């Protein structure tokens, strides 16, 4: 399964994001590795242009579902890997309730032996003293099930889900996600039936790192079939 073979072992991952939110331009690089046999990955991100104008947690979803563990009985529903090595384009719109929104476009594919997620994010309509720009979110993250549905139209998948971010002293700030993924190559892909990705994420910090950074650790497993 060409694509599948690509993920038998541990694969290094590189993430490159260029962003602009309300005119606050910034860049982030991440490096790590993942092992789809188990569905685990670890990534370390560094804000390379200065202190991030948005809270780290808000960028988690943006920063590689091909690393999900798809159980054997579900192998025929693994679109993400089926598109590799040429890759896929992942696009999203994330609306922070009562706040601005992020629009992202990324490309995920192999470069050499590394799996790279190269992103362009543009956010607007945000509120300066808002939870976002004001950095009032706690530095934590939750676990969720994200439902995946095919999209014959785009020849890929559609997905929608909400992320709940905890507010320092408030409730939570909702971040409503709309996602589309389409193959990059012209070859055939796997269009799966409806299912979901069970996703565990947690955030950490690195004792030796002086720059603004985030350590993201996760375990993701496909299910629902």
Site of tokens 């507010």: 167
DSSP state letter for 195: E
Cα dist from 105 to 13, 132, 138, whole Å: 18, 20, 26
Q: Which long-range contacts (CB under 8 A, 24 or more apart) does 6-10 make?
A: 6/81, 6/84, 6/85, 6/110, 7/35, 7/36, 7/37, 7/66, 7/67, 7/81, 7/84, 8/36, 8/37, 9/35, 9/37, 10/34, 10/35
Cα dist from 165 to 2, 38, 125, 218, whole Å: 38, 26, 19, 17
Q: Distance between the two ends of the chain, CA-based, in angstroms?
A: 20
Centroid of chain to Cα 152: 22
Rounded CA-CA distance 35/57 in Å is: 23
CB 84 within 8 A of CB 107: no
Nearest Cα residue to 187 out of 111, 64, 87: 87
Preceding amide of 86 cis, omega within 30: no
Sign of the alpha-carbon torsion through 11, 35, 27, 88? positive
CB 182 within 8 A of CB 74: no
Q: Which residues contact 134 (CB under 8 A, 6 or more apart)?
A: 127, 128
Rounded CA-CA distance 136/170 in Å is: 9
* Pair type for strands 101-111 and 10-21: unpaired
For domain 1-225, which architecture applies?
Beta Barrel (2.40)
Rounded CA-CA distance 206/198 in Å is: 26
Rounded CA-CA distance 59/40 in Å is: 19
Experimental approach: X-ray
**Residue 147, H or E segment:** strand 144-151
Taking only Cα atoms into account, the Rg of the chain, rounded to an integer number of angstroms, comes to 17
Phi, psi (rounded to 5 degrees) for 140: -150, 180
Rounded CA-CA distance 181/21 in Å is: 23
C-alpha dihedral over 22, 27, 33, 35, to 10 degrees? Answer: 20
Domains in the chain: boundaries: 1-225
Cα dist from 21 to 57, 101, 126, 150, whole Å: 15, 9, 8, 31
Centroid of chain to Cα 113: 20
Phi, psi (rounded to 5 degrees) for 149: -130, 145
Q: Is 165 exposed, middle or buried (0-12, 13-18, 19+ CB in 10 A)?
A: buried
Rounded CA-CA distance 219/181 in Å is: 21
Nearest Cα residue to 84 out of 116, 127, 56, 39: 116
Site of tokens 């976002």: 132
Rounded CA-CA distance 44/50 in Å is: 16
């Amino acid at each position: 399964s060409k694509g599948e073979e690509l993920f038998t072992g541990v694969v290094p991952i590189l993430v490159e994001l260029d962003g602009d939110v309300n005119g606050h331009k910034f860049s982030v690089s991440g490096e790590g590795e993942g092992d789809a046999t188990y569905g685990d990955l670890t990534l370390k991100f560094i804000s390379t242009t200065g202190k991030l104008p948005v809270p780290w947690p808000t960028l988690v979803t943006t920063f590689v579902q091909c690393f999900s563990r798809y159980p054997d009985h579900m192998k025929r529903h693994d679109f993400f890997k089926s598109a590799m090595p040429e890759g896929y384009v992942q696009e999203r719109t994330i609306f922070f309730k009562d706040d601005g929104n992020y629009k992202t476009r990324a490309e995920v594919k192999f470069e050499g032996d590394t799996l790279v997620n190269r992103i362009e994010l543009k956010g607007i309509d945000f509120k300066e003293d808002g939870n976002i720009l004001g950095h009032k979110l706690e530095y934590n993250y939750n676990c969720h099930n994200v439902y995946i549905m095919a999209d014959k139209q785009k020849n890929g998948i559609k997905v929608n889900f909400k992320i709940r971010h905890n507010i320092e002293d408030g409730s939570v700030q909702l971040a409503d996600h709309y996602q589309q993924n389409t193959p990059i190559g012209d070859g055939p892909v796997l269009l799966p039936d409806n299912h979901y990705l069970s996703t565990c994420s947690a955030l950490s910090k690195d004792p030796n790192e002086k720059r603004d950074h985030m350590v993201l650790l996760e375990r993701v497993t496909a299910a629902g079939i």
